[PDB]
Amino acid sequence: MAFASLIERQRIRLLLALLFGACGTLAFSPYDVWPAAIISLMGLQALTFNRRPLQSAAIGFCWGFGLFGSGINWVYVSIATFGGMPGPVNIFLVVLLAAYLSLYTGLFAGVLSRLWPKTTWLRVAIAAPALWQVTEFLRGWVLTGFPWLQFGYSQIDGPLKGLAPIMGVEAINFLLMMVSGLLALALVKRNWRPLVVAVVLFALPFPLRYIQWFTPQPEKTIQVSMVQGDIPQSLKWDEGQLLNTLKIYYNATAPLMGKSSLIIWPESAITDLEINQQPFLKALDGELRDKGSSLVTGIVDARLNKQNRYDTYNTIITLGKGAPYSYESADRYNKNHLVPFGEFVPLESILRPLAPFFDLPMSSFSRGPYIQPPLSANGIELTAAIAYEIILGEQVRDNFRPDTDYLLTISNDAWFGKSIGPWQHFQMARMRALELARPLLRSTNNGITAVIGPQGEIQAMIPQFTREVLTTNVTPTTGLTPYARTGNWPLWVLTALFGFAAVLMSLR
Ligand SMILES: CCCCCCCC/C=C\CCCCCCCC(=O)O[C@H](COC(=O)CCCCCCCCCCCCCCC)COP(=O)(O)OCCN
Ligand SMILES: CCCCCCCC/C=C\CCCCCCCC(=O)O[C@H](COC(=O)CCCCCCCCCCCCCCC)COP(=O)(O)OCCN
Ligand SMILES: CCCCCCCC/C=C\CCCCCCCC(=O)O[C@H](COC(=O)CCCCCCCCCCCCCCC)COP(=O)(O)OCCN
Ligand SMILES: CCCCCCCCCCCCO[C@@H]1O[C@H](CO)[C@@H](O[C@H]2O[C@H](CO)[C@@H](O)[C@H](O)[C@H]2O)[C@H](O)[C@H]1O
Ligand SMILES: CCCCCCCCCCCCO[C@@H]1O[C@H](CO)[C@@H](O[C@H]2O[C@H](CO)[C@@H](O)[C@H](O)[C@H]2O)[C@H](O)[C@H]1O
Ligand SMILES: [Cl-]
Ligand SMILES: [Cl-]
Numbered sequence: 001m002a003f004a005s006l007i008e009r010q011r012i013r014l015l016l017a018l019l020f021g022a023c024g025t026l027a028f029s030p031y032d033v034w035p036a037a038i039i040s041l042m043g044l045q046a047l048t049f050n051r052r053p054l055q056s057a058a059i060g061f062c063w064g065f066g067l068f069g070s071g072i073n074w075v076y077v078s079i080a081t082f083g084g085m086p087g088p089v090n091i092f093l094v095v096l097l098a099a100y101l102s103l104y105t106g107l108f109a110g111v112l113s114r115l116w117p118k119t120t121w122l123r124v125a126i127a128a129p130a131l132w133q134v135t136e137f138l139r140g141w142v143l144t145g146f147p148w149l150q151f152g153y154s155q156i157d158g159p160l161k162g163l164a165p166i167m168g169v170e171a172i173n174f175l176l177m178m179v180s181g182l183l184a185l186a187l188v189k190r191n192w193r194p195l196v197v198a199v200v201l202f203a204l205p206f207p208l209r210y211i212q213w214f215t216p217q218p219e220k221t222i223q224v225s226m227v228q229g230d231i232p233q234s235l236k237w238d239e240g241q242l243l244n245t246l247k248i249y250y251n252a253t254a255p256l257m258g259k260s261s262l263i264i265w266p267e268s269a270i271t272d273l274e275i276n277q278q279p280f281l282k283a284l285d286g287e288l289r290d291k292g293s294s295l296v297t298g299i300v301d302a303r304l305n306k307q308n309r310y311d312t313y314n315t316i317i318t319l320g321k322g323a324p325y326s327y328e329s330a331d332r333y334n335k336n337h338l339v340p341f342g343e344f345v346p347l348e349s350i351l352r353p354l355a356p357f358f359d360l361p362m363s364s365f366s367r368g369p370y371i372q373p374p375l376s377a378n379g380i381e382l383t384a385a386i387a388y389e390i391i392l393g394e395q396v397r398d399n400f401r402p403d404t405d406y407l408l409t410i411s412n413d414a415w416f417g418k419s420i421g422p423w424q425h426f427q428m429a430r431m432r433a434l435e436l437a438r439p440l441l442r443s444t445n446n447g448i449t450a451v452i453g454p455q456g457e458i459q460a461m462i463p464q465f466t467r468e469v470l471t472t473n474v475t476p477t478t479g480l481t482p483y484a485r486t487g488n489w490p491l492w493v494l495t496a497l498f499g500f501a502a503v504l505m506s507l508r
């Protein structure tokens, strides 16, 4: 009686919401405690029972602030080291970002309480997943979006991993929210109905992990090299850094020519405008072709548009065998989804002169097309996403092609130091290779450089913060997974009919 009465105090539920929210962060890399996601969601769903609507929104806000406050605070690293702002505003922006993200999880908990106030089996297993889908969709969409920390990504090695190739990661977000809601109902009402339903709903997708939607092509097996140039962020875009960077990347590549069919350099590895590097690129391209090797590398490219102005792109270019270099070549990719404040500054005229954080080197990029053809090298088809774009599962899936041999992502994660950010980023990358049943080549500056197999497994990786090259054999795969054929409109029809059924019963 006294114990139950203590838990139903509102100031206590808030404190418990921080702890239960923060606990979610342990589900993602580098911690990888996948049950922490179920614990964290049970907290969010149980802690909101039997509360007023605006009371429940306060609890849902604090849960997110525990989650995002402990999970994405690594943004502080990049803001502190390169932001050039005083201490208090630096942490104010980090708490500001974590508070903004928490609106979407507070909005979720408010709506769920007004429309479904009774702690029923319908509000936890039907209304909650659908409304979560909507609010999480809204979080990853408004103001360019930021869909970081979705619990489905923690199931990359867990029992739900067979579900991603069929409906994508957001279906795992859906099921985890649902199974966690039945467990939460099973405790508060001390009923075994929801427990047995939750354990079967959770266990049913386990045999899925054994379906191989893909077929490996061992005849196409190559040696690939990815050079981790380890250029320090503070010097990377300094003009005096360029010759050293070119020497590092070139010296690592020349001895592998004739041995590695494909060589990859990371995001904007060549830190100069493509048009200023034509003697280098031409000489390099001829050298690659004589030996039978192809190179894909990041670079910056300012290109003249229709209205006689320059659009500067964050771009990948290709060179060498089966991909002869030209400034007029179409074998290239321009980053489409730009990172806010790092690659473009909203309200540019107001914010640019405030602090170096709002005027970072090369923070004036344009956006390439949403859909772009694969890169082509040696006869290999590479679906490309640059850095952050690899976490956008639908966008990656929409650029995917049936004749894609590998997924390719190149990234520069040095902004985030030795924090957990690079590992969270790396983990989400792995979900794309599982969803689409292709290997993924990840070339980074110092971030996690690795080759990911067609089921999300780590085939190879080199350690962070070192100047080395990962050279390994990799094998393409062919074949279409259900999620490749569809994207996530099926999950959206489930979200719609659950959300419809749920809103119906609540209109009584
Ligand atoms: C009953 C108990 C309830 C208590 C509720 C608590 C819930 C949990 C609370 C917090 C969880 C999250 C805490 C992490 C927050 C910050 C972590 C931290 O400080 O370590 C950060 C560094 O942490 C690290 O990255 C350590 C190294 C980890 C990488 C090496 C191991 C990798 C493991 C592989 C992971 C999976 C990859 C794929 C393999 C399957 C600090 O970084 P910094 O550059 O020095 O500056 C950071 C300034 N912000
Ligand atoms: C409404 C409330 C919002 C709060 C406003 C302030 C808080 C924003 C805090 C952080 C925003 C971004 C922090 C700096 C990140 C810089 C990374 C970057 O852009 O670099 C590039 C990074 O590109 C990548 O995709 C690699 C990894 C990026 C992962 C993204 C993680 C940070 C995203 C946080 C932004 C949050 C969105 C805002 C909410 C809608 C590459 O480096 P470079 O080519 O050598 O040169 C960079 C070009 N100048
Ligand atoms: C208000 C109570 C809500 C309870 C639950 C019912 C909510 C409605 C449920 C389902 C809406 C039906 C939408 C399915 C249509 C599918 C179309 C389609 O394939 O496009 C999909 C995306 O298009 C959409 O689904 C649009 C988003 C639908 C939002 C509908 C919710 C209304 C928004 C305001 C509601 C605010 C809370 C309610 C306030 C009382 C697939 O593309 P993607 O990969 O998700 O894009 C990612 C880019 N960031
Ligand atoms: C205090 C901070 C604000 C609190 C609440 C925030 C509400 C802000 C108003 C909601 C509308 C914001 O305006 C937002 O701008 C960007 C424009 O890039 C749009 O998003 C835009 O880029 C995305 C990329 O994912 C495209 O998919 C989208 O089609 C496009 O319109 C958002 O769809 C739009 O909603
Ligand atoms: C409640 C019962 C509902 C049963 C669903 C039966 C379909 C009717 C509802 C959808 C209407 C048309 O159905 C449509 O089919 C195509 C073929 O996969 C889907 O997919 C199509 O559009 C998407 C973009 O959204 C493309 O990325 C995709 O390449 C294309 O094939 C559409 O997203 C879906 O909207
Ligand atoms: Cl009190
Ligand atoms: Cl019930």
Ligand SMILES: [Cl-]
Pocket (backbone or CB within 6 Å): 289, 320, 321, 322, 323, 324
């Ligand atoms: Cl050729």
